[PDB]
Write a protein that binds this ligand. Structure first.
Ligand code: 0BM
Lengths: 250, 31, 11
């Protein structure tokens, strides 16, 4: 997270850390969606142009964390994965189209003050919240600049109009992505960066007062570059595939 | 299945205790 | 950099 600040304890109880067994390192961010399900980006697990192919036995899921490095004994909870579900139409070849993945936990995780799931949006929520100018929130332990924080980082970023997203890149944008960040003429800064990937982009509803995950930290050209925006996997558009796998696989 | 658990997006240390985090207002004022 | 996690999680 570039140009962000420290998170308060229990500010994102759905934030998950994707952690590699050997070598012991941070892989990605992720989010708790229920007691047995975790949402991430498919690129965290599978990206053939960079030789990335991580299976279930290669990693652990660390929920309830604040510190990046510490083993937070009676706060964090470590889970093994049962199965990884990568969207079948995930496009690693061209543009990271459909950069989404589901992970089933071996055993359910008990909730606490530090472990709680986030809501997935419905049609009502998406229509109300997913508008240009509205702010969302990104969290993670990734790079501070294009450098490693000791504690979870947060940044509030506004949603950008589809034409501005299309104009800022030479990559082919689809309706399964949205972009966020400040325009050069806005003065404010901030972006997600390497290590943040798979992490949630959330909005709080002013109606019910719930937190909804609208996006997944996907791609961007550099970090916090002027005239450049962070691209996020559109959660609502892909919600039909999330329901399919959760309902089919328990 | 479906809208999720009745629990979702309400934090035990914030919404449950009627407390706000430091930067929350910035989001709500944008709406 | 990272602290060692219990060996129960690695087996
Ligand atoms: C790392 S890069 O600057 O080369 N940008 C590529 C652009 C791209 C290439 C091919 C397809 C789609 C997008 C990218 O973001 N990539 C290359 C493949 C994976 C992804 C990545 O590095 N993701 C990590 C982060 C996410 C957050 N981000 C941001 N919001 N500025 C910076 C990159």
């Amino acid at each position: 997270i570039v140009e962000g600040s420290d998170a308060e304890i229990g500010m994102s109880p759905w934030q998950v850390m994707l952690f590699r067994k050997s070598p012991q390192e941070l892989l990605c961010g992720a989010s708790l969606i229920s007691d047995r399900w975790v949402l991430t980006a498919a690129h965290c697990l599978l990206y053939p142009p960079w030789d990335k192919n991580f299976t279930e036995n290669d990693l652990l899921v660390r929920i309830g964390k604040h510190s990046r490095t510490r083993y937070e004994r009676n706060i964090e909870k470590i889970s093994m994965l049962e199965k990884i579900y990568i969207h079948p139409r995930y496009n690693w070849r061209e543009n990271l189209d459909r950069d989404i993945a589901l992970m089933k936990l071996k055993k359910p995780v008990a909730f606490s003050d530090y472990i709680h799931p986030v809501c997935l949006p419905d049609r009502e929520t998406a229509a109300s919240l997913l508008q240009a100018g509205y702010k969302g929130r990104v969290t993670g332990w990734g790079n501070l600049k294009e450098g490693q924080p000791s504690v979870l980082q947060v940044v509030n970023l506004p949603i950008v109009e589809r034409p501005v997203c299309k104009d800022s890149t030479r990559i082919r944008i689809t309706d399964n992505m949205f972009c966020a960040g400040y325009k050069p003429d806005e003065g404010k800064r901030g972006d997600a960066c390497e290590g943040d990937s798979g992490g949630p982009f959330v909005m709080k509803s002013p109606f019910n007062n719930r937190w909804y995950q609208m996006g997944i930290v996907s791609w961007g050209e550099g970090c916090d570059r002027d005239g450049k925006y962070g691209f996020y996997t559109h959660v609502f558009r892909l919600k039909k595939w999330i329901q399919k796998v959760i309902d089919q696989f328990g | 299945f479906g809208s999720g658990e009745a629990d979702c997006g309400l934090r035990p240390l914030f919404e449950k205790k009627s407390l706000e985090d430091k930067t929350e207002r910035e989001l709500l004022e944008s709406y | 950099d990272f602290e060692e996690i219990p060996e129960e999680y690695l087996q």
